[PDB]
Each structure stands twice: as structure tokens, then as C-alpha cells.
Design a protein around this ligand. Structure first.
Ligand SMILES: [Mg+2]
Ligand SMILES: [Mg+2]
Ligand SMILES: [Mg+2]
Ligand SMILES: [Mg+2]
Ligand SMILES: [Mg+2]
Ligand SMILES: [Mg+2]
Ligand SMILES: [Mg+2]
Ligand SMILES: [Mg+2]
Ligand SMILES: [Mg+2]
Ligand SMILES: [Mg+2]
Ligand SMILES: [Mg+2]
Ligand SMILES: [Mg+2]
Ligand SMILES: [Mg+2]
Ligand SMILES: [Zn+2]
Lengths: 222, 125, 215, 81, 129, 55, 97
RNA sequence: UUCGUUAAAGA
RNA sequence: GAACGAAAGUCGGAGGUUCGAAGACGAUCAGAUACCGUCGUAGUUCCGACCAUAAACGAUGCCGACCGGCGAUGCGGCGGCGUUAUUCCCAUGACCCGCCGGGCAGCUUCCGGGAAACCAAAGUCUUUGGGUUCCGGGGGGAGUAUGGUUGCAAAGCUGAAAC
């Protein structure tokens, strides 16, 4: 119910109502800074879950100085999820910071087919991998209506990703969520980064939104 | 003894940034100006802030300061430069530097008016 | 083309400022810019590809309709003088010297900008804008020497960025070509003043000595 | 990506790089879409027409972009002979 | 010392693809290597290639694309029967829709899709996708 | 500025000390907080000057 | 872990270095590992050089120098203050002026 | 120059 | 299966400077039989034989290829009206500049790896396969017992179980 006070020129484009979809931002990979931009775009991406509230300790002259570290996975079920990690001295402060950092670190998820081209994609486009720490997480395409067969934390992460059918293969210390969830996040992030044989042609090279609506940005800055 | 606090220097920089034409070189006037334009409970803090404001005025009025720069000081920095001497901008058309750049002017087609001939041994470094 | 070709006044100003001579160390991406090595350590940069990279730098600067989205930064004192008057010339943003790292990353600092393009003078003296380019997605035009790294650099202009006269000549000729592409100055019209604002001024010892000798 | 019906099913078509023909990622903040304008005749007049060169993150980090922009615009016919 | 020259070729191709270069130098020449790169040309993952016909053994230079994710050699050249290709389908190729596997059939160096139409099967040189 | 209270609590382990100190907010008008401002805080006025020079 | 890439000494090509005795504790240390410095002292302290020059026979024509190959080990050299400790980014340095 | 010991637990 | 294999140790022959296991003392400590000092046996030396062990280390098998740069060094080869030495062309000598091959190395790097230290290899590995050899499967028991074998012996190689 408060005035948003737009900054960083991307929010000024959003409040000038010139970027029609978040897909237009991910075409050009512009850096997001404030968290409510994707709340202005997607109102159904509020579906989130805190994964683990674990404490960390720092040994000081008083003794142990505790502060809590929160993991929050947000996600729109149409193929947009984010993973936020934030440590602070308060529970709710760490939770809100992890929500804001997940809103920042939201990425799009590419959804492919198992081998038939009926429609409504349900799986990863190919066998992808993700590594954080030591945990290699491999995502494999699955037939239609198979499901997600994994640990409950990346099973919930893929269920938020909208991958209806996927096989998983994890190796390393799978017990640490702070590496295993980030490895799953890297695995679902590399799906667009994979070079695929239906993306051969040279792209359209559409104009940047800064070039397209420079004058609105000039008249709202000056 | 004058190794004054960061809050003292910060308040003086806020004063010299907001209100510059209200200030001068006289401490006994700048103190009353600072008391008209600011609220300081402590008289020793008043004297210390106004003294460092006078020191900032003596620094800015004498020379250019990076630590604070208003638009009027930016226009003064623009004004102090336009007196351009014409002594050594372009030399006469007799330059001798290198037979290698003589070969460059032979390859890439130009006039090659001046002489270009030096001989150097290999006593480099 | 046919008007973008180099002329005798241009090559006379190049040979007068002395930018054809460069450093003594090579880089593996400067072999296309050097032509022939010279004895006593000093190396020779060609002039045609220098002119062509200056031409492409001018094209990239003129290619945005808003001149305020081009940031121009130099930290060393040979470029600190030229950057301010280059920004006051046509449209650029005057910021030079102490970069204050975190200029383009965080927003609790009031010196936060959103540019579309960056032109720097020395990469080794401006390693920090080269670092902070990677979070803002902006290109870099750098007045590179023969011994300068080329990380996060898109347009490299081979030159001698150590000489103050060379730096001033390059900023003058860059502003010249930018204004001629914008249409302010025509092709058959020289600039109204000799480029010394862009060069340098020596402070008040021999400046006032030459003033009192010229009274 | 197309189905048997021939729809455009993919969410967005990412930018293929103009240096190594590699897909620029959605979070690859080390990429750039360079812009160079076209030049008119003897008058030397600015044109609104401009061509865009996409350079990706690993190329920009290794420094291949300096050679790559000139070797990309040489086939374009705008940088040199 | 010098063995599996197709692997010696494809490791150079893979390092050039990971580096991001334009064209590679490959010091051996086999008709195996020429037909393998001919299959890769026909499926368009690489481009034009020129074979410097040295008097001893030539040198292949392949104009790359920047397209190859991974190309390699299965080492011992397994003897693979039909109705056993699906193990290598699920093991090698990243998906059902992507990639191709070069077989060594009885009627020449062939492809994974060409082998099931020719109905021959046989040995495996490697894989590329 | 600070209201400070030191009290005792008698539990089965013995007596326990509790210390509650509160720094009061600055209220220039009202009996809730103190009217004297902080000596460290130096408050400045806004730029008052405006348009209309000569003619 | 590895504290040093050079493992202390400079043996990288060969496999055996001759042990040369230390100066203070007389422990045999291989010569690429021991602290091997070269002290050029004046044979008279400068507090008495002027006294000997004023009370000498010749008119300042002789000034001998005492040369010693000082050869410490790294166990007593730290106690003898020569080879004091440095930081992780400071071990990579070279000879001080 | 030398100066020994202090368990189990307890955040 | 075979040849060498530091130091120590064993069997003969010659000597015995220095150091020096054991040993004897002189000291410090509550207690030295130790660290400190004095003397000194075997050994340390050489020629013949045996033993085959080490933090025998780069704690990193060998062969072949690929993937950045830079400044040096050692050895050959090549080029450069440059300098310097003989008496003067003449040939190598010394220095300088650059390249080639393989060698001991170093600095930086988001080339990539790894848990990190760090590594142009410890990279080319879930996008997993160039060839080949030897070894590890929680820590102790234990490199022990019991067998086989080598050795003059000390011991070496192979080497389990209960708990
Ligand atoms: Mg565990
Ligand atoms: Mg240690
Ligand atoms: Mg050894
Ligand atoms: Mg205890
Ligand atoms: Mg021996
Ligand atoms: Mg006997
Ligand atoms: Mg004997
Ligand atoms: Mg004893
Ligand atoms: Mg003795
Ligand atoms: Mg052993
Ligand atoms: Mg071995
Ligand atoms: Mg040599
Ligand atoms: Mg000779
Ligand atoms: Zn010692």
C-alpha cells in the first residue's frame, strides 16, 4: 500500500509500463536489483517454501555467537523458480531476506519433451547437470506422467519448476541442503544454456528496451 | 588538538554543500550564519564546526577541492581553463623520429615531407 | 567511405603528439596492431588500424540517441583533465579520478548510475570499471597501449596512453569524429581552438613564469 | 521449439552469440549487445540504421572480443578494407 | 604410443570447441576420420573441411561452427547387435530427440538413424551431439 | 535518556538479577520523551532559496 | 598441507644436496636449504676507525674488510632474528634493501 | 636457566 | 624373473686424523640413565662379499595428443653493414637481438578441475571410454600371529582371523 519509489531505470520502465512480460527481460539478461519487479509481473509466484532454518556459530570472546541461516525456494509453477539464501540474527529477518534474494535470483526453466511432440511440455529438454560444492545432480528426461523421483527437497523444487516428469541422479554429500539445493538450481539453470538443435538460426536481434523507450526514461529522470 | 570528529566534519560538509553563498572568511559572521541555518545544542560544538567551516572556506577559495563540489564550483572549474595558450600545440613541419615510421609512411600512402633518419644500436634495456 | 580516410593534418598531429611509439612489452592480442618492432625497446603502432578503431569507437558512441548514457572515466592525471572537458563538450558524464568502487553495484551510495556504454583511458589504471562492467552489461572502449590486458574490453584503440599530448590528441580527435557524425561540425570545417584543454596544464610555477615573461 | 501442431512452444528464444554461436544465458551478466551505426556518403551523415553484435561472457572474459568484433565487422564491410 | 587416431582427432575438436576457436589442425588421416567428419558435415554440426594431402599422412583442417557440445570416441569399439542399441541410446545421447551415434556397419560408416533403416547394426566408432 | 531498573527474582535455584534499561525517544513536545535534543545530532534545515533573480 | 611450493630448499632437478654445517648449533643442513648470507664487516668498528687513523703510522692508506660466509640453519636463524616470519601473501617476496 | 598435575560431564 | 639401490647393520684384510651408538664421569633438577661440557669403544676410510630398507618425496606410474600469455636460465642449430678482442682479410672466442627443438624452473589468469590448500596439470569427467601396470574399501587389532621363502644375523618379501 506504499509508494514503490522506482530506481535502477528498469523499475522506471516497469512503472512506465513498457516491458510487457518478464520474458522480455530474460531475452536480454538484464540485472534485476529490487525484488518487487517480479511481484509486479507475476502475482502467482508467491508459492514458496522454506527448506531449512539452520544455525551457524561464530566463536568469540563471549563464547558462541549464533545467527540463523534461511533457505527459501520460491516459484511460479509455469517454469520460473528462485532460491534465496540469507543469514541474520533473527528468524523472520533471515526469512524475509531469503525471500527477497530468491525474488532476485529467480530464473526461467526450460520445459521439453520425452520424444513425442503432442504439446504441453512436461520434462527437461535433455540430460542436464548441476554442481555446487561437490554434489553432482543429473536431471534426465522422463516419459509422460512418470513423476519426480528424487529427494523431497529437489522434488519440491522441481514441482515448483513445473517439470512434471524427471529422473534424478545425485552424487556427493546429498545431506547438505546448502549445496544440494544450489546444485539442483544450477542444473535447472543450465537448461537454456544447453545448445539445442531447434535453435539453429541467427536471432532476430530486437532492440533493447532502453533504446526503445529512452525518451520516457529521460522525461522521468529529468 | 584539531583532530576533530567525523560528525563535526560531516556537519561542516553538509553546511558547505547546502549553503555556500551564506558563508565567508570571518569566523564571527560564519558562526552566526551556522546558527541561523542549523541547530547545535553545544556551544563548543558550534565554535568547532564554524572554525572548520572557515578552514574549508580558506581551502576552497584558494584552491580546488575534490571533497566537496557544488555546481558553482563546477562552473568555476570550467571558467579557470578556457584561457588557452598557443605555443606548442602543433610544431613546424620538420619532424625526425624513425626510419621505421618512414617505412610506414612509404607503405601507407602519405606525403612524407620531413626527413626521418636515425641510427640506433641494440643497447636497449 | 572516401572522407573517413586519414589526411595530412591528421598524420601531422599524430607525429607531433608522438603516439606512433608505444611500450616495450608485447601482448598476444596486440600483434594485429603492431607492425614492425624497433631497436632500443620502443615499438611502433600502425596508424590506419588506430584510425579505424577510433572510427568504430565514434560509431559506437554516436549509435545511442541519448548522449547521457555514455560514461567516460579516467583515474590518472593525464586523462582527468581531458575527461571533464570531453564530457562538457558534447554529452558525456563527467566522472574521473577516484572511482569509489561500488559505483555501479549498490544503491545506498548516491553516486549510482545506469549507463549504456563506457569509455576508459587506461585498463591497468581502470581495472575496477572493467570489473564492474560484468554486473551492468555495458561495453568498454579503452585507449590501450602495447602492454595492457584486454579483459572485459570490446573496442581497443592501440596507442600510447602514457603521453599526455597523445591522450589529449585522442580525446580531441574522438570528440571531433563524434561531433562530425552527430552533424554539429561539418567535414570541411576545422575545430575552433587548438587542443590544449584536452592536453594538459602545468601548475603555477612555470605557468606563472611564462605568464610574467609574456606580459 | 515446435510440437506436431507447429506451435511456438518455447518461452523465449535466447540470444545466440555473434562470436562463438553459443547461447547467452538468462543470468549471464558478462554478456553484451554491442551496437554500431551505419554511415552515409561523402557528407558523412548519421543513419538511424544500426547493426547489433552479441558477444558472450566467456569471450568477454578471455578477451577474444577485441579480435572478434573486427573479424566480425570485416565480413560486414564496415570496419576496414 | 600412437593409437586411436579418431580419438586423437576428436579430443582436439573438443578442446577447440571448448576454447571457442574457428579451425583445428588434426595430424592423422584415416578414411574412418574422413567418413566420420563427412557424417558430421551431413548433419551440419561442423562445416567445410580441407585435407592437406601430405605425402606421408595428411592434415585435416575443419571449419568449426561453435555448435558441438560433445563429440568423443567409445574406446574398444564394442560389437553392438540390433535391439541392443537402446542401451547406448539411453547411455550416450542426451535425449531421444537430440544427437547421433556413428555406427560401423557392413555397408560403410553410417549413422544411428541410418543404421535402423539399413537394418545392419555393427561396431561403434563414437558419438557426437 | 535511559530509564534503568534492577530487580530480583526468587526462583528455586536462588535469586536472579534482571536489568532493564530503555533509551527514550526524542519528543520536543510531550511528556513521553525528553525535550532536549542529542548533542551528537546536528540537524540542518532544508535549502530554502528559490527562483526569481533580477527581472 | 603444503606450506611451500619449493618445500624449503631449491632442489628441483637433482636428488641429493651436500649437508654443510650450521654456524651456531653446528647442525648439518643441505646448502640449498640453509640460510647462506655474506657479511662484509669492517675489521674495526667505526667508533674506533678514527682513533686508529689518528694514532696510525700511514696517512690513511689501508682499510681492510673482513669477509665471512655466514651460514645459519633455519632452526637457529629464526632465533637469531635474520629470517623472521611473514604472511601468506608475504612469503612470495624477494631481498630487502 | 627451570617451573609437574587437575577426570566424567556439563550450552 | 633380473640389474643397481642413501645411511645404518654383518663377514675378512690395511689404519685409527676428526666426529662418535654403547660406556665412564663433571653439572641443572624433586628425580637423569637426557638435553650442556671432558674422555672414548664399534662405526665413520679403502678393497673384496652379504643385507634391499627411508619422509627412497614431486607424499603425484609410463607412453601419445590438445587447450593462454610473459620474463629468464642451461645445450645445440639458424639469421642480424651492432660492439669487443690478435697483426690485417681469414675461421672460431666474449656480449647484444630474435626464432627453433627438447630440459630444470618461475609470475599472472574466471581454460577447467577440486572439499579446499592448490594445480598449464591434480584440465580435456554425469556432455562420464587413447593404451597399459600396481594398489585402497571406516578406525584399531596389524604390517601382528601362523605358514612358505631369502639371509651369517639383524631382519626382508607374502601375510589372515577372533574381538
Ligand atoms: Mg553424511
Ligand atoms: Mg603444519
Ligand atoms: Mg632423496
Ligand atoms: Mg580434562
Ligand atoms: Mg651402505
Ligand atoms: Mg669374528
Ligand atoms: Mg671390518
Ligand atoms: Mg642414556
Ligand atoms: Mg671428542
Ligand atoms: Mg617401503
Ligand atoms: Mg611404478
Ligand atoms: Mg644459446
Ligand atoms: Mg667452439
Ligand atoms: Zn643453527
Amino acid at each position: 500500500d506504499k509508494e514503490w519509489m522506482p530506481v535502477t531505470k528498469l523499475g522506471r520502465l516497469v512503472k512506465d509500463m513498457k516491458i510487457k512480460s518478464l520474458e522480455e527481460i530474460y531475452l536480454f539478461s538484464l540485472p534485476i536489483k529490487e525484488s518487487e519487479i517480479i511481484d509486479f509481473f507475476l502475482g502467482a509466484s508467491l508459492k514458496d517454501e522454506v527448506l531449512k532454518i539452520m544455525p551457524v556459530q561464530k566463536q568469540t570472546r563471549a563464547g558462541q555467537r549464533t545467527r540463523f541461516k534461511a533457505f527459501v525456494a520460491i516459484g511460479d509453477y509455469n517454469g520460473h523458480v528462485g532460491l534465496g539464501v540469507k543469514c541474520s540474527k533473527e528468524v523472520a529477518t533471515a526469512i524475509r531476506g531469503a525471500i527477497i534474494l530468491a525474488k532476485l535470483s529467480i530464473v526461467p526453466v526450460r520445459r521439453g519433451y520425452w520424444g513425442n511432440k503432442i504439446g504441453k511440455p512436461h520434462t527437461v529438454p535433455c540430460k542436464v547437470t548441476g554442481r555446487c560444492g561437490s554434489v553432482l545432480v543429473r536431471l534426465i528426461p522422463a516419459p509422460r506422467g512418470t513423476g519426480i523421483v528424487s529427494a523431497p527437497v529437489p522434488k519440491k523444487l522441481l514441482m515448483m519448476a513445473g517439470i512434471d516428469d524427471c529422473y534424478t541422479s545425485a552424487r556427493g554429500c546429498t545431506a547438505t541442503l546448502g549445496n544440494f539445493a544450489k546444485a539442483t538450481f544450477d542444473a535447472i539453470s543450465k537448461t537454456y544454456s544447453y545448445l539445442t538443435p531447434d535453435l539453429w538460426k541467427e536471432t532476430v536481434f530486437t532492440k533493447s528496451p532502453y533504446q526503445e523507450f529512452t525518451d520516457h526514461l529521460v522525461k522521468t529522470h529529468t | 588538538g584539531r583532530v576533530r570528529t567525523k560528525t563535526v566534519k560531516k556537519a561542516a560538509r553538509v553546511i558547505i554543500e547546502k549553503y555556500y553563498t551564506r558563508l565567508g572568511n570571518d569566523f564571527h559572521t560564519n558562526k552566526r550564519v551556522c546558527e541561523e541555518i542549523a541547530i547545535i545544542p553545544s556551544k563548543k560544538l558550534r565554535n568547532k564546526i564554524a572554525g572548520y567551516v572557515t578552514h574549508l572556506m580558506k581551502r576552497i577559495q584558494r584552491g580546488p577541492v575534490r571533497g566537496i563540489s557544488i555546481k558553482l564550483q563546477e562552473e568555476e572549474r570550467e571558467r579557470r581553463d578556457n584561457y588557452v595558450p598557443e605555443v606548442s600545440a602543433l610544431d613546424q613541419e620538420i619532424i625526425e623520429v624513425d626510419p621505421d615510421t618512414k617505412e610506414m609512411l612509404k607503405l601507407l600512402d602519405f606525403g612524407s615531407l620531413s626527413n626521418l633518419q636515425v641510427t640506433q644500436p641494440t643497447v636497449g634495456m | 567511405l572516401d572522407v573517413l580516410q586519414m589526411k595530412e593534418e591528421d598524420v601531422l598531429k599524430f607525429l607531433a603528439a608522438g603516439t606512433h611509439l608505444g611500450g616495450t612489452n608485447l601482448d598476444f592480442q596486440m600483434e594485429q596492431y603492431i607492425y614492425k618492432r624497433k631497436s632500443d625497446g620502443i615499438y611502433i603502432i600502425n596508424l590506419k588500424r588506430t584510425w579505424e578503431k577510433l572510427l568504430l569507437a565514434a560509431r559506437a558512441i554516436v549509435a545511442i540517441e541519448n548522449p547521457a548514457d555514455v560514461s567516460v572515466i579516467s583515474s590518472r592525471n593525464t586523462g582527468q583533465r581531458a575527461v571533464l572537458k570531453f564530457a562538457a563538450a558534447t554529452g558525456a558524464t563527467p566522472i574521473a579520478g577516484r572511482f569509489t568502487p561500488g559505483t555501479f553495484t549498490n544503491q545506498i551510495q548516491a553516486a549510482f548510475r545506469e549507463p549504456r556504454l563506457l569509455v576508459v583511458t587506461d585498463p591497468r589504471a581502470d581495472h575496477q570499471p572493467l570489473t564492474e562492467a560484468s554486473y551492468v552489461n555495458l561495453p568498454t572502449i579503452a585507449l590501450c597501449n602495447t602492454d595492457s590486458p584486454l579483459r572485459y574490453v570490446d573496442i581497443a584503440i592501440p596507442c600510447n596512453n602514457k603521453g599526455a599530448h597523445s591522450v589529449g590528441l585522442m580525446w580531441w580527435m574522438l570528440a571531433r569524429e563524434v561531433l562530425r557524425m552527430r552533424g554539429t561540425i561539418s567535414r570541411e570545417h576545422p575545430w575552433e581552438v587548438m587542443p590544449d584543454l584536452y592536453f594538459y596544464r602545468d601548475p603555477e610555477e612555470i605557468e606563472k613564469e611564462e605568464q610574467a615573461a609574456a606580459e | 521449439m515446435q510440437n506436431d501442431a507447429g506451435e511456438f512452444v518455447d518461452l523465449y528464444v535466447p540470444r545466440k552469440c555473434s562470436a562463438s554461436n553459443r547461447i547467452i544465458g538468462a543470468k549471464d551478466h558478462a554478456s553484451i549487445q554491442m551496437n554500431v551505426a551505419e554511415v552515409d556518403k561523402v557528407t558523412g551523415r548519421f543513419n538511424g540504421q544500426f547493426k547489433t553484435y552479441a558477444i558472450c561472457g566467456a569471450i568477454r572474459r578471455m578477451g577474444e572480443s577485441d579480435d572478434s568484433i573486427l573479424r566480425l565487422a570485416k565480413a560486414d564491410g564496415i570496419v576496414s578494407k | 604410443v600412437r593409437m586411436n587416431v579418431l580419438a586423437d582427432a576428436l579430443k582436439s575438436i573438443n578442446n577447440a570447441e571448448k576454447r571457442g576457436k574457428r579451425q583445428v589442425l588434426i595430424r592423422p588421416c584415416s578414411k574412418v576420420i574422413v567418413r566420420f567428419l563427412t557424417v558430421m558435415m551431413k548433419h551440419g554440426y561442423i562445416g567445410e573441411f580441407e585435407i592437406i594431402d601430405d605425402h606421408r599422412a595428411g592434415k585435416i583442417v575443419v571449419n568449426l561452427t561453435g555448435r558441438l557440445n560433445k563429440c568423443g570416441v567409445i574406446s574398444p569399439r564394442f560389437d553392438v547387435q540390433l535391439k541392443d542399441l537402446e542401451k547406448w541410446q539411453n547411455n550416450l545421447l542426451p535425449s531421444r530427440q537430440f544427437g547421433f551415434i556413428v555406427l560401423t556397419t557392413s555397408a560403410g560408416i553410417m549413422d544411428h538413424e541410418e543404421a535402423r533403416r539399413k537394418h545392419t547394426g555393427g561396431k561403434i566408432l563414437g558419438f557426437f551431439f | 535518556y535511559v530509564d534503568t531498573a534492577v530487580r530480583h527474582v526468587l526462583l528455586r535455584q536462588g535469586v536472579l538479577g534482571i536489568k532493564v534499561k530503555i533509551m527514550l525517544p526524542w519528543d520536543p513536545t510531550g511528556k513521553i520523551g525528553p525535550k532536549k535534543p542529542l548533542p551528537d545530532h546536528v540537524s540542518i534545515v532544508e535549502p530554502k532559496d528559490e527562483i526569481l533573480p533580477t527581472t | 598441507t603444503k606450506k611451500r611450493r619449493n618445500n624449503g630448499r631449491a632442489k628441483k632437478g637433482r636428488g641429493h644436496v651436500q649437508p654443510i654445517r650450521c654456524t651456531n648449533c653446528a647442525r648439518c643442513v643441505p646448502k640449498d636449504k640453509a640460510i647462506k648470507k655474506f657479511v662484509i664487516r669492517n675489521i674495526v668498528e667505526a667508533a674506533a676507525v678514527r682513533d686508529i687513523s689518528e694514532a696510525s703510522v700511514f696517512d690513511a692508506y689501508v682499510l681492510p674488510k673482513l669477509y665471512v660466509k655466514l651460514h645459519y640453519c633455519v632452526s637457529c636463524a629464526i632465533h637469531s632474528k635474520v629470517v623472521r616470519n611473514r604472511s601468506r601473501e608475504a612469503r612470495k617476496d624477494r631481498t630487502p634493501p
